[PDB]
Amino acid sequence: DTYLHETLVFDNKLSYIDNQRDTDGPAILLLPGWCHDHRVYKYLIQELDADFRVIVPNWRGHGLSPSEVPDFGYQEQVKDALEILDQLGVETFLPVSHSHGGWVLVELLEQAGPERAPRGIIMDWLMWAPKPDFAKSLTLLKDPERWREGTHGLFDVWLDGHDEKRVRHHLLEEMADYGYDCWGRSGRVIEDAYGRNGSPMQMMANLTKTRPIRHIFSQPTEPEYEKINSDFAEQHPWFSYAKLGGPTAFPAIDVPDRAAVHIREFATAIRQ
Numbered sequence: 567d568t569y570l571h572e573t574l575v576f577d578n579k580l581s582y583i584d585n586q587r588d589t590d591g592p593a594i595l596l597l598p599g600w601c602h603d604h605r606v607y608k609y610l611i612q613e614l615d616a617d618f619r620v621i622v623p624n625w626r627g628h629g630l631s632p633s634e635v636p637d638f639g640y641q642e643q644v645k646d647a648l649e650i651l652d653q654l655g656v657e658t659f660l661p662v663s664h665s666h667g668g669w670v671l672v673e674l675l676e677q678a679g680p681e682r683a684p685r686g687i688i689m690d691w692l693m694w695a696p697k698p699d700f701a702k703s704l705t706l707l708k709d710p711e712r713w714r715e716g717t718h719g720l721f722d723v724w725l726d727g728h729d730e731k732r733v734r735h736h737l738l739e740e741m742a743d744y745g746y747d748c749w750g751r752s753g754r755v756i757e758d759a760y761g762r763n764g765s766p767m768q769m770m771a772n773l774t775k776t777r778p779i780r781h782i783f784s785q786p787t788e789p790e791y792e793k794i795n796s797d798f799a800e801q802h803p804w805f806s807y808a809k810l811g812g813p814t815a816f817p818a819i820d821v822p823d824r825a826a827v828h829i830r831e832f833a834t835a836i837r838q
């Protein structure tokens with residue numbers, strides 16, 4: 567796409583979207599999850615393109631040409647993300663994560679500090695620790711034998727019974743070139759992130775400087791998930807949530823207009 571660039575980040579060539587929009591801060595930093603790239607954000611980029619600078623970093627061995635790379639985790643994702651922003655001369659940015667991109671976003675808030683990264687939006691990120699099926703998925707992903715079966719179970723959960731053409735295209739075509747090197751790693755990093763931090767919510771409550779964060783999600787759809795968000799929201803003045811009511815675990819693809827309005831509201835609030 568017309569905004570895709572490549573640059574050496576430390577000892578690694580990384581692709582990134584940068585629309586290089588000459589405009590008032592903050593920059594909007596869209597953070598992919600594991601084993602997909604900027605392609606997940608092509609519709610959200612269209613929504614924001616005119617009014618904001620939009621950067622989408624790809625992770626090591628992520629992008630149009632996936633590749634085996636040495637082991638890394640979310641701490642390196644943060645460093646990779648900041649180096650691209652430093653190279654681009656970006657100061658203030660509003661990070662927005664998809665799913666387990668959320669580990670990068672929260673660590674980026676701690677490392678960048680509340681001046682550089684005053685707020686955050688986490689999209690469709692499992693707020694509780696894995697329930698048995700998701701734990702079984704991560705186990706399958708780490709298995710050199712059963713990793714594809716791992717991704718197949720996840721694709722079933724993410725689509726949640728929906729013939730969602732754009733999301734199916736993302737999973738079965740735009741992720742098709744990712745292999746066991748990425749998927750095994752994702753499974754190790756997510757497993758370890760939960761083990762170490764306990765949960766997304768524990769990690770966010772544990773920031774030195776708490777800041778406005780909104781969780782915008784469509785999945786899971788059960789009332790009991792809406793409750794752990796409502797209970798966390800009552801406990802933490804800085805945490806809010808919106809249920810977007812989209813079909814899939816990919817609101818950036820299937821309700822981009824809705825993702826955009828929340829990102830805009832947080833951007834507008836930083837500009838004041």
Ligand SMILES: CC(=O)Nc1ccccc1C(=O)O
Nearest residue numbers: 599600601602665666667752
């Ligand atoms: C593309 C994507 O959502 N990444 C994942 C890969 C493995 C396990 C979980 C996820 C996730 O972030 O939901």
Ligand SMILES: [K+]
Nearest residue numbers: 728729730731
């Ligand atoms: K449909």
Ligand SMILES: [K+]
Nearest residue numbers: 799802803805
């Ligand atoms: K609140």
Ligand SMILES: [K+]
Nearest residue numbers: 784812814817
């Ligand atoms: K959705």
